[PDB]
């Protein structure tokens, strides 16, 4: 298990992509999956040690580009939408 | 002028109370948000 890294996890039958983090979700001692009103996998109980990991889909987002007119300048700034500052 | 000012202040105070007593007073806004959420929720219930 590795936390805070976008991985392709395969907890039992459940497979999927995302970053997984330790969580305070109080699973009942029998529950395995996590879900939400969107019916998507939110958290997961670690099968071999009973720990709770919420699954954030690892960061995506649009890449907007801020540019003046080409005739003005070729300098460009970029805007990674819906993401912190990760890779530059 | 004094009566108009008193009526104006009282009517504004009632506006505060009406919006407090009536949360639905903002249904026209809340419905908009609900419609968007429902559409997004429906758009996610299609990958199931």
């Amino acid at each position: 298990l590795v936390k805070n890294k976008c991985v392709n996890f395969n907890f039992n039958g459940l497979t999927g992509t995302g970053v997984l983090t330790e969580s305070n979700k109080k699973f009942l001692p029998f529950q395995q999956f996590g879900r939400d009103i969107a019916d998507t996998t939110d958290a997961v109980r670690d099968p071999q040690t009973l720990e709770i990991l919420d699954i954030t889909p690892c960061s995506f987002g649009g890449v907007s580009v801020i540019t003046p007119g080409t005739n003005t300048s070729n300098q460009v700034a970029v805007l990674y939408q819906d993401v912190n500052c990760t890779e530059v | 002028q004094k009566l108009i000012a008193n009526q104006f202040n009282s009517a504004i105070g009632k506006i505060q109370d009406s919006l407090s007593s009536t949360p639905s007073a903002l249904g026209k806004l809340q419905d908009v948000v609900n419609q968007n959420a429902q559409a997004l929720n429906t758009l996610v219930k299609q990958l199931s």
């Binding site: 939400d36 009103i37 969107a38 998507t40 939110d42 954030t56 889909p57 995506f60 987002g61 649009g62 939408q81 819906d82 | 919006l19 407090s20 949360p23 007073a25 903002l26 806004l29 809340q30 948000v33 959420a37 997004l40 929720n41 758009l43 996610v44 990958l47």
Partner: peptide, 28 residues
């Protein structure tokens, strides 16, 4: 603002970006 009601992130879980309004509510 207290009479109008994370869930939008739950749809964001599956490729659904929610751009912020240009005029922030304080600037509005």
């Amino acid at each position: 603002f207290n009479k109008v009601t994370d869930l939008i992130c739950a749809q964001k879980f599956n490729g659904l970006t929610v751009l912020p309004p240009l005029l922030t509510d304080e600037m509005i």
